[PDB]
Amino acid sequence: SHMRVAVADVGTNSSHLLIAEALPGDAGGFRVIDTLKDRTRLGECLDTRGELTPEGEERLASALTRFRELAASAGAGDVRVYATSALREAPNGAEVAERVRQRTGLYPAVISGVRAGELTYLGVREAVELGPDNVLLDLGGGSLEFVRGAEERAADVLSLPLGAIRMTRAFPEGDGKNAGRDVADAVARQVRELLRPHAGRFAARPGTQFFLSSGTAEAAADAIAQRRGGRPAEAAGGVNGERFTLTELADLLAHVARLRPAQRARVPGLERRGDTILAALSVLHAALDALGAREVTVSEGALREGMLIEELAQVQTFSLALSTRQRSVLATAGRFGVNLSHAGQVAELSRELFDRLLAAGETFPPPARSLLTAAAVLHEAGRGFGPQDIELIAQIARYHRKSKPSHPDYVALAPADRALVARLAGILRVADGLDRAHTGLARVDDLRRQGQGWQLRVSGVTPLDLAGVGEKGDLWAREFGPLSVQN
Ligand SMILES: [Mg+2]
């Protein structure tokens, strides 16, 4: 058997789960085992102050509980969860995310709109045939990402607050005859307003291919196909790779705008989106029209597929850079069943902290880097190394302030090895906190001596990661002096 992995995203409208298995060949690919979508509709559970309600917290917990059960059922174990920037509230995101972590075990890490767009672009890459020059729009309930790239990754990302829920709420629809058309016009003016300053970066040139993802675009492609006399997206197994034109979109929108909100849910393809679909289609049409697009291709791949790709990419990049002996450690860790993505991130952070400390004058014995790397890989387990090295690794990997010296089989290392274990376990614990949310995103920017202590600048950290460093950096402060974490 190979490695089963689980990723999940929490957006404004829905939550998504991907369970997959890595491909043999350390190539970066995967095989899809199962997928799940939960219509969490958190954008409907925001209060007057932009915070998520307890009902919205309940819906979130149910989604992560279903997600975590399916993943454990497949052998996936840990589920990395990213949330878009609006789903978890304007000021209380940290509190909401800690709460669901306590209730379910999974921690929804808020990422930026830019990072969401980059990852979504990778999922699109996994689904469709990108060219040398691609513009992707990803419309959700909260934001719209514009992304331009070539055949492998995003080069430029813009994130605008033009989500289908947000636009539906911002232009309440009247009860008159042209009420739909008026909502669509006003939404179209909001789109141009926010897009005009940066439209050039995403405008059509000869050969530009436009792509659309997420559920609005998927519902639109279905509806347009059935307008050309097609069958529900059941036939043809979905809408992946389907194409449609700006004109067809406009006609769909004209039809939807003439209909009453109730009647839109009886338009074939729109059956599940009647409440937002008018605003959402005005956003797509108005944004594409501003960019000069004439035809699009719809993609069923999106954020969750890009999450899997980035995770496997970080895993195998670390694996390839490792030595023969260290790769054997990673393989052994996998056999025990540890999260290799978490192992690799903690090893990389450990190595980064270790190297900064060396550059700052901290002395370490030659095998120190090698012992820390191996203990980092094995730190969550419930060949080519000497028996002393293995014992050091073991103690680094399983360090706790409370040993009992007199109890039989107590392992008392020589004073120099005692001191080494304590310093390397202090690094390891800080690195472990920096990936406490299991995002793979933390990075060490700088590590400077702050008097008799140190100052550590980090990026890509969630509130849970910073709190973890404060709880686990106690050993570091004892060995290296007080530690302040910033950014
Ligand atoms: Mg850990």
Numbering used by the authors: -1 to 380, 402 to 422, 425 to 508
Task: Quote the paper.
Degradation of polyP into phosphate is involved in phosphorus cycling, and exopolyphosphatase (PPX) is the key enzyme for polyP degradation in bacteria. The PPX hydrolyzes and releases the Pi progressively from the linear polyP chain. Bacterial PPXs share conserved catalytic domains 1 and 2 belonging to the catalytic N‐domain, and most members of the PPX family contain two additional domains 3 and 4 in the C‐terminal. The exopolyphosphatase belongs to the ASKHA (Acetate and Sugar Kinases, Hsp70, Actin) superfamily protein, which utilizes a common fold for binding and catalyzing hydrolysis of ATP phosphoanhydride.
On the other side of the polyP binding tunnel, E114 interacted with both P5 and a conserved positively charged residue R86 which was located at ɑ‐helix 1 (ɑ1). We also determined the crystal structure of the E114A mutant of DrPPX. In the structure of the E114A mutant, the ɑ‐helix 1 adopted a shifted loop conformation, and the E114A mutant lost most of its enzymatic activity, suggesting that the interaction between E114 and R86 might be crucial for the catalytic function of DrPPX. Moreover, crystal structures of PPXs exhibited that three conserved residues (E114, D136, and E143 in DrPPX) interacted with a water molecule, which is consistent with the molecular dynamics simulation results. Mutations of these amino acids into Ala also lead to a decrease in enzymatic activity.
